[PDB]
Amino acid sequence: NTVPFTSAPIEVTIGIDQYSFNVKENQPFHGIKDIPIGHVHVIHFQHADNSSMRYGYWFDCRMGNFYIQYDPKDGLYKMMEERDGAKFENIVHNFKERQMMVSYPKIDEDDTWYNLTEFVQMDKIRKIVRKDENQFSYVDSSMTTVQENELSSSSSDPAHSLNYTVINFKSDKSYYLNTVMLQGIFKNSSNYFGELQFAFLNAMFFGNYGSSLQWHAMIELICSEATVPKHMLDKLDEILYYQIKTLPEQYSDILLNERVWNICLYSSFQKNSLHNTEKIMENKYPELLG
């Protein structure tokens, strides 16, 4: 499929999924062509002025035709759905502006993006990023989570808050909550893997700190188990492998937690349960062992 751009009036680093590039202010650009038919994609933006806040839009080309048009009032590149299909294809399939588009690289033998978004689906994202008026979902670098807001004395609306699954580790009520999740996860853990990956992606690309904590809280949820089903670990280890594989070679004190990782070493000591994960960890990060 194809996600066209109305214009590029402001210099901004325009990216799609893992890949990213930068457009110039007042530079001829009409969109991104030859987008691979996937299940979940994300297109982000990063202004040259502000190199801290990154905003993007999770979407799926299969459930509608989407384009990008700049808004002078908000000063942000907005995604909008084109309901009139006949008008959309006439804009896209026109010959003159298809040369102003950038072609999505043929993934070929590489399977990077799929291994990171294998369990991530839009109907799940819609339940995390609260919005129903649109088929896409706006996620910002500065966005807080529901758990993060209730922790703070201040408060934020659930719409602008990342409604991740709140996980607690203490020590009356709410103690039986964790054991019910673990049992539920042990069969048909799509929501878990999906949320794990999605929380990782927001933390990695957008730099969402709350998403970084959530990712660690979900890793800690399983790594705190001495005995967990093998079918779970074989997939988890693989999932955690490709995630660590995209992390920068230099030790990132903020993005990954040392305290949490040390308890995974204790958990995975029977196979080891996280064989492939530990392998790339010791090759990329020569830090002390647990």
93, 22 Cβ separation under 8 angstroms:
no
Q: What are the CA-CA distances from residue 81 to residues 9, 60, 235 (Å)?
A: 20, 11, 35
Instruction: Spell out the residues 6+ positions from residue 170 whose beta carbon is closer than 8 angstroms to its own.
Output: none
| Domain closes at, from 142, 167, 193 | 142
CA distance 4 to 188: 37
CA distance 2 to 20: 16
Residues 169, 156 share a domain: yes
Query: Coil, strand, or helix at residue 66?
Result: strand
Strand partners, 17: none
CA distance 22 to 16: 11
Taking Cα atoms as reference points, which of 55, 11, 2 lies closest to residue 32? Answer: 2
| Domain closes at, from 90, 109, 142 | 142
Q: What phi and psi values does residue 120 have, to the nearest 5 degrees?
A: -85, 125
CA distance 69 to 48: 18
Residues 156, 20 share a domain: no
Q: Nominal resolution in Å? A: 3.2
CA distance 159 to 246: 30
- Residue 142: DSSP 8-state: T
For the range 89-95, what are the long-range contacts, defined as Cβ-Cβ under 8 Å and sequence gap of 24 or more?
A: 91/4, 91/67, 92/2, 92/4, 92/31, 92/33
Strands in the chain per DSSP E: 3-4, 12-16, 19-23, 31-33, 41-47, 55-59, 66-71, 76-81, 101-103, 137-140
Residues 90, 164 share a domain: no
Look up the CATH number of the domain holding residue 175.
1.25.40.550
| Domain closes at, from 94, 117, 142 | 142
Helices (H), 24-175: 85-92, 112-116, 122-128, 146-151
Residue 221 in tokens: 């949820």
Residues 212, 118 share a domain: no
Sign of CA dihedral 112, 261, 173, 177: positive
Sign of CA dihedral 135, 139, 144, 148: positive
Residues 67, 197 share a domain: no
161, 146 Cβ separation under 8 angstroms:
yes
Look up the CATH number of the domain holding residue 52.
2.60.34.20
* Overall domain count for the chain: 2
- Residue 63: DSSP 8-state: G
Residues 147, 118 share a domain: no
Tell me the residue range of the domain where 209 lies. 143-290
CA distance 199 to 240: 12
Q: Which amino acid is at 32?
A: I
Radius of gyration of the chain (CA): 20
Residues 223, 107 share a domain: no
For the range 91-95, what are the long-range contacts, defined as Cβ-Cβ under 8 Å and sequence gap of 24 or more?
A: 91/4, 91/67, 92/2, 92/4, 92/31, 92/33
User: In sequence order, what DSSP letters do the residues of 200-242 get, joined into one string?
Assistant: HHIIIII--HHHHHHHHHHHHHHHT-SS--HHHHHHHHHHHHH
Q: Residue 211 class from Cβ within 10 Å (0-12 exposed, 13-18 middle, 19+ buried)?
A: buried
Residues 256, 164 share a domain: yes
CA distance 68 to 284: 38
- Cα 136 off chain centre by: 14
Residues 39, 161 share a domain: no
